[PDB]
Symmetry: C4
Subunit: 90 residues, 4 copies
């Protein structure tokens, strides 16, 4: 489960990194950053400048938001929770 969500999230972010670096001309790190804050809805960056970028972003959000949050709802629920919970046992 967690491993699958791990991989699925990775592929989605790889696609975004490749897309934004190419179409929006961003350095890879900036393309990855944009992909991450966009799918997590933080969105603390300017929007894409090209229409291709805007269209892809619309589809990217609808298809990737569900997956990203599913992974987050496990990275802290089935991994970080025990670490803290089980440790709260004297």
């Amino acid at each position: 489960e967690f491993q699958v969500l791990f991989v699925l999230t990775i592929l989605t972010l790889i696609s975004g990194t490749i897309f934004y670096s190419t179409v929006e001309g961003l350095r890879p790190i900036d393309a990855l950053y944009f992909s991450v804050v966009t799918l997590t809805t933080v969105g603390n960056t300017p929007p894409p400048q090209t229409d291709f970028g805007k269209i892809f972003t619309i589809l990217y959000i609808f298809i990737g938001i569900g997956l990203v949050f599913g992974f987050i709802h496990k990275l802290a629920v089935n991994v970080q929770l025990p670490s803290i919970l089980s440790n709260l046992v004297p």
Copy 2:
């Protein structure tokens, strides 16, 4: 279900596209982009410039956020999940 959420989300986005292109003077694609990132809470754009735009946006958010996320919670839960899940079966 999914088909209904599909249509309901479409109508909501069509209304936003028409509104922002008219009142905020945005090109249709930009009006659609604003509608999408606003309802998904990504919000990586400047805010509306007119008071009419601000008021509509407030109401648009309250009425559309629930629907948009309901659709997302199906586009990946009752469509993308199987595709990946059932495929994880050797």
Copy 3:
């Protein structure tokens, strides 16, 4: 329930409108808009300029986000759902 969430959300937004119009010097409509997009996490505006504004915003988010989304999870779940659901009955 819905009526209570309705009122509770109203009071929270009234407080934000009063605060931002006074401390950040915003016109009431802009103060209301900021309060709304902040609590719904859309956040498509610049941040507060004063430290008082930043501190209040931090507390406002933690205390208001839960309520706002609770109301949204009813404005479309116990009001908009039937309207569309029951109507989907030939």
Copy 4:
């Protein structure tokens, strides 16, 4: 539970405050504000300027979003709910 989420959220915010004040050169209050609106996804600020800042932010979001919202889902569910609910009893 609530007390644990309280503390866990505090530590996460302390780390962010220390990181952004040092690496992004922000005044402590601004570093705390950035940490808060980033993890709650409000994101109404410009993005980090350094690559170190961008990388940390990516990891910070994935590891902190789950915790922050878990705490919020209690600050209003197991603390603010009763205060209002039990009080709605004539």
